[PDB]
Design a protein around this ligand. Structure first.
Ligand SMILES: Nc1ncnc2c1ncn2[C@H]1C[C@H](O)[C@@H](COP(=O)(O)OP(=O)(O)OP(=O)(O)O)O1
Ligand SMILES: [Ca+2]
Ligand SMILES: [Ca+2]
Ligand SMILES: [Ca+2]
Length: 341
DNA sequence: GGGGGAAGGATTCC
DNA sequence: ATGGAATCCTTCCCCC
């Protein structure tokens, strides 16, 4: 089975460059302003020009300006990048019937019933890159292999504006050479739990006794890794379906006062419902980020669909349950709707 | 013993 | 140090 993974380069930033090519060449940082103080907030992402100096996704905007004070700082326009994304996805949908849209700028393609060996995959890779570039002026990285996981890893290795093939032969080498902290789905937490287990490479999972793994990282994560290590990982590409919709906003100041939070919560609801569009949810969760950036939530599933009125009343109840079940001051507050009928 | 759910949390990642 | 969403884990619960 051959998988071709497509990942758009510094997406949010590259799009801002697209909508105003005068930006190209200069440091571009797309920010998410929390509105607590002048430049409060974090970086959604930045182009390589700015990234070469440490300015990247996740760091505070203030930390970015202290490094590249003259870089161009733009507020994140999620709706725009989303529409540009869709168009490009449709484009891909023409190279394969089998398409999995992993994120706002990622997608795996099953080109098995469309290609023989990796040579034809490579060409198709370029042919697609070219297409997208000519159609939307967007550069992307392409990764190809026997399964999704490796297809992705291939792309990571070739970023940016790259293309790479990881044939069954190299797959063997990486299962021994690849740091397992570079295996998708393995973050710092799992990384350190694997380090304390002597597993630095994928193959190291082969030594360890299963039951021991399942206990340190979990059965699912355990079986996952073992499969990859056995060169037997082989999940299929399938259409993903939006399972939840919601919004969470940062409050000007941190509160613990019901009446002070409410307005923020109601706004999260309103927008959430607009995003629902046609969807009617049976479950609603109130999510709160406490002063010490911890995340607390409370929810409830109804035996029917939830109307905006019902979400309003219930939301206030769930918030109250949070204020009385936790002592910390609430920093961010929002809602999450799920279990669509 | 074990088949569901539901709830709250933990992890990862785009 | 923003904000959106899937997945998986543990625990509690109801009951055959
Ligand atoms: N921490 C984050 N906060 C908000 N948005 C994020 C964050 N991390 C990633 N994103 C969003 C914006 C990114 O452009 C987008 C698409 O893919 P992603 O791999 O995450 O970044 P990117 O487009 O810059 O990738 P690349 O390294 O190839 O440039 O996901
Ligand atoms: Ca990308
Ligand atoms: Ca990506
Ligand atoms: Ca990692």
């Amino acid at each position: 089975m051959i998988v071709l993974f497509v990942d758009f380069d510094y997406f949010y930033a590259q799009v801002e460059e697209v909508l105003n090519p005068s930006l190209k060449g200069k440091p571009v940082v797309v920010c998410v302003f929390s509105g607590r103080f002048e430049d409060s907030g974090a970086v959604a992402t930045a182009n390589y020009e700015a990234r070469k100096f440490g300015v990247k996704a996740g760091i505070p905007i203030v930390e970015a300006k202290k490094i590249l004070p003259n870089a161009v700082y733009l507020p994140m326009r999620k709706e725009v990048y989303q529409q540009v994304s869709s168009r490009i996805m449709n484009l891909l949908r023409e190279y394969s019937e089998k398409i999995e849209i992993a994120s706002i700028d990622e997608a795996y393609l099953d080109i098995s019933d469309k290609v023989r060996d990796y040579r034809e995959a490579y060409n198709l890779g370029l042919e697609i890159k070219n297409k997208i570039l000519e159609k939307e002026k967007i550069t992307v990285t392409v990764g190809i292999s026997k399964n999704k996981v490796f297809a992705k890893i291939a792309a990571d290795m070739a970023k940016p504006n790259g293309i790479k093939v990881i044939d069954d032969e190299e797959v063997k080498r990486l299962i021994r050479e690849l740091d397992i902290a570079d295996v998708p789905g393995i973050g710092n937490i799992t990384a350190e739990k694997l380090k304390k287990l002597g597993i630095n490479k994928l193959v190291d999972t082969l030594s360890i006794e299963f039951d021991k793994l399942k206990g340190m990282i979990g059965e699912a994560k355990a079986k996952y890794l073992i499969s990859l290590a056995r060169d037997e990982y082989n999940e299929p590409i399938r259409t993903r379906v939006r399972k939840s919709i919601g919004r969470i906003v940062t409050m000007k100041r941190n509160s613990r006062n019901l009446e002070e939070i409410k307005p923020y919560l109601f706004r999260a609801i309103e927008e959430s419902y607009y995003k629902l569009d046609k969807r009617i949810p049976k479950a609603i969760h109130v999510v709160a980020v406490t002063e010490d950036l911890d995340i607390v939530s409370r929810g409830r599933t109804f035996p029917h669909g939830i109307s905006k009125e019902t979400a309003y009343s219930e939301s206030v109840k769930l918030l109250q349950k949070i204020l009385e079940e936790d002592e910390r001051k609430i920093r961010r507050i929002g809602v999450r709707f799920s279990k669509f009928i």
